[PDB]
């Protein structure tokens, strides 16, 4: 999905192995905030949100807590106390088209900044001046969304990148999303300190 229309997936009750993704060189960016990226499988939270969108490379640095820019201010804002991870990978072979792609948009103007995890898809004509726009574009009256125009020949800083932000939400409810929690071999007839299921 486009960055302004970021998609949200809900994850309840399913074991996942974040080790096959962390060990993958395919992902150009794997940065976690509030939780160490190595120690991830042990953590347990009741629900998981997966926000997905597409940006350009120069904006991948904007997907982080306490950041500013077009994306952070007008498209997707992460809270300062965000506890989760941000993963991004180059999608030039998929989301770039010769002549420019017209399917991915981003919000260019907005009078106020987005709240954390806010989703704005309004297409109201941005009034930059004092004169009120009446639905017609013109001087100080611009459309709020703009197309990236991704091309395969673009610089890697301007090539398309697919970004997925995983957040782990714990509520006043049982924790239902758990990590792999691998095991080891067992030995008999010897004094051992053991840790079975619970």
């Amino acid at each position, epitope marked *: 999905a486009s960055v302004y229309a970021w998609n949200r997936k809900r994850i309840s009750n399913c074991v996942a192995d974040y080790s096959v993704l962390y060990n993958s060189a395919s992902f150009s960016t794997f940065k976690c905030y509030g939780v160490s990226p190595t120690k991830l499988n042990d953590l347990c939270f009741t629900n998981v949100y997966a926000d997905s969108f597409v940006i350009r490379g120069d904006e991948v640095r904007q997907i982080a807590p306490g950041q500013t820019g077009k994306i952070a201010d007008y498209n997707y804002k992460l809270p300062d106390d965000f506890t989760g991870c941000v993963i991004a990978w180059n999608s030039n072979n998929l989301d770039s088209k010769v002549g420019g792609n017209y399917n991915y948009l981003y919000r*260019l*103007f907005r*009078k106020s900044n987005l709240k954390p995890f806010e989703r704005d898809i309004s297409t109201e004509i941005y009034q*930059a*001046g*004092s*004169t009120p726009c009446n639905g017609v574009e*013109g*001087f*100080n009256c*611009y*459309f709020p969304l*703009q197309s990236y125009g991704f091309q395969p020949t673009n610089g890697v800083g301007y090539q398309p990148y697919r970004v997925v932000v995983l957040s782990f939400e714990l509520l006043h409810a049982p924790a239902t999303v758990c990590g792999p929690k691998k095991s080891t071999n067992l030995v008999k007839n010897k004094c051992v300190n053991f840790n079975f299921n619970g």
Partner: antibody
Amino acid sequence: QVQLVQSGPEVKKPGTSVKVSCKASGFTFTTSAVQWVRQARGQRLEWIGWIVVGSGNTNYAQKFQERVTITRDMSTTTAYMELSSLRSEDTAVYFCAAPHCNSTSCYDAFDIWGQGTMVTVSS
Amino acid sequence: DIQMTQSPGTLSLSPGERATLSCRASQSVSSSYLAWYQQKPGQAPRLLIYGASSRATGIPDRFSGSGSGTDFTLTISRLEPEDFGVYYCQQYGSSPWTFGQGTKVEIKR
């Protein structure tokens, strides 16, 4: 210091191209717009076209749709105007104009103007 | 395209009189999208009035503006020696944003 500085004088042969620069200062370029206007020596003002800095969308006049292309670069806060296939009729003074804007709103007219760039085209 | 016409061609007036300039559009244009500019020989245009009735920053209060639709007027209450130049009216609502042909205000003698 809300400034708008243009290129120096240009002297090009007929059939060539000229690229006039226009650099902004003081206000936030990223959310403004830049128009280009030409004036022949002792004549009236002839509007060439305008560009939205944030989006890059351009609108040209009928008489300049064929040989004028207006561009911008927010990184160097500079807008350019390329004029291809020059001729003696193009010998004039070119101005760029922009409304000064803060981070969220813009002025309701073109109050900032450049000093002007004289372009002479002859053999 | 919208055609902007200015009048008079030459305004010969004495310093201290009241100047009046006219601007006519070939079709009705928004009052909030009209501007007036002043240009002196060898100088860049200078914005005087916008939105037909909004004085710009630093422009003296002797400059005023009125009009609506196709006819607009620029009024100078008391003409100062620093005001003798060329005046243009431009509409910037409908593209192309055409200019007028200019009005030369000279010192009468």
